[PDB]
Write a protein that binds this ligand. Structure first.
Ligand SMILES: Cc1ccc(C2CC2)c(-c2cc(F)c3c(c2C)CCCO3)c1[C@H](OC1CC1)C(=O)O
Ligand SMILES: Cc1ccc(C2CC2)c(-c2cc(F)c3c(c2C)CCCO3)c1[C@H](OC1CC1)C(=O)O
Ligand SMILES: [Cl-]
Ligand SMILES: [Mg+2]
Ligand SMILES: [Mg+2]
Lengths: 51, 144, 143, 50
């Protein structure tokens, strides 16, 4: 059970990024070595459902 | 971690339209769709459908921008598919598919109809002596 | 015989038309969001289905897309016999899963294929995807 | 072996028996009637998957 985050800053989707924390309004992620705070609506948190 | 789960995907083109083709390398079985644009979104959607049908473990593609896109990464992550970027199989299959399409093209108005007739023809043809469509089902069931 | 028997039906979500095929003996499903509930779209779906599985008999209700000449043409070319509550149960199950995953995707069609994947891979002890492959391979291997 | 579907009315009619396929028109028989239909209004389909 692990997660990667795909997100938009630019309508192009970025990712995968590491999920650092999830809140009711935002997700904190690390893409490469930059930490970013991303509104929930602009992020998809996707698990490796199919293994 | 062997041949039952390994697929190759590539795009070919006819009549200005984009055809996305998947081949199960060990059987020669194929699936194809005419997609409206050669984008990550259309490729990811194709892959989710494919992964729901078969136990897709590895997909081998070239470096076309739709295959290296973020949207396809997301699809493979969710579905559990490893991407890798026996040799030249899909390129040979593209040619064979276009050959069959040309043989039946005048039997349908729409290119997509002839594409799917061609897929059917290829998958059902017994080489002896099983067909590609029989070979994939036999390979996967034995791997269960 | 059970290897070749399928049921097809349309269901509706978000004003979109979902065409569902169920392999009766396994519970395996495939589905597509089609732009209109027409014979042309139904026939194209059947041609794709018949190219991947040994489709011998298809059971449907009497919806006009299923009784259309275009679908009769598909079934004649592909060698399919047409007959006129497995699929209905399956429509409800598919919609339940779709509802559970709907906010994970922008597009309804994405959620539909996620739900198909979820349904087909779930081990209830084999999954529907394992069962269809096993049923059909047994028929092939025993001639 | 072959079926011809054809239009006159947007619904596809047939199947009819194929008698001759020309490049401009098709001669068919549908319920005792001999009909000549333009190629563009005809679909000639074989029971490939029998
Ligand atoms: C439009 C869009 C844009 C960006 C993405 C990805 C990078 C974030 C996706 C997408 C693609 C997936 F394959 C996928 C998922 C998503 C969310 C979720 C898990 C199952 O696999 C989609 C997706 O549509 C695409 C035709 C599939 C949608 O409907 O949201
Ligand atoms: C547009 C149209 C109109 C009428 C028909 C039928 C009554 C004559 C067909 C049709 C349907 C088939 F299922 C089919 C074939 C044809 C020709 C050829 C052999 C394999 O199966 C089509 C067909 O498109 C439909 C989405 C498939 C096309 O592209 O020509
Ligand atoms: Cl927050
Ligand atoms: Mg290529
Ligand atoms: Mg119905």
């Amino acid at each position: 059970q692990n997660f990667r985050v795909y997100y938009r800053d630019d309508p192009v989707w970025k990712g995968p990024a590491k999920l650092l924390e999830k809140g009711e309004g935002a997700v904190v992620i690390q893409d490469n070595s930059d930490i970013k705070v991303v509104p929930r609506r602009k992020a998809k948190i996707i698990r490796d459902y199919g293994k």
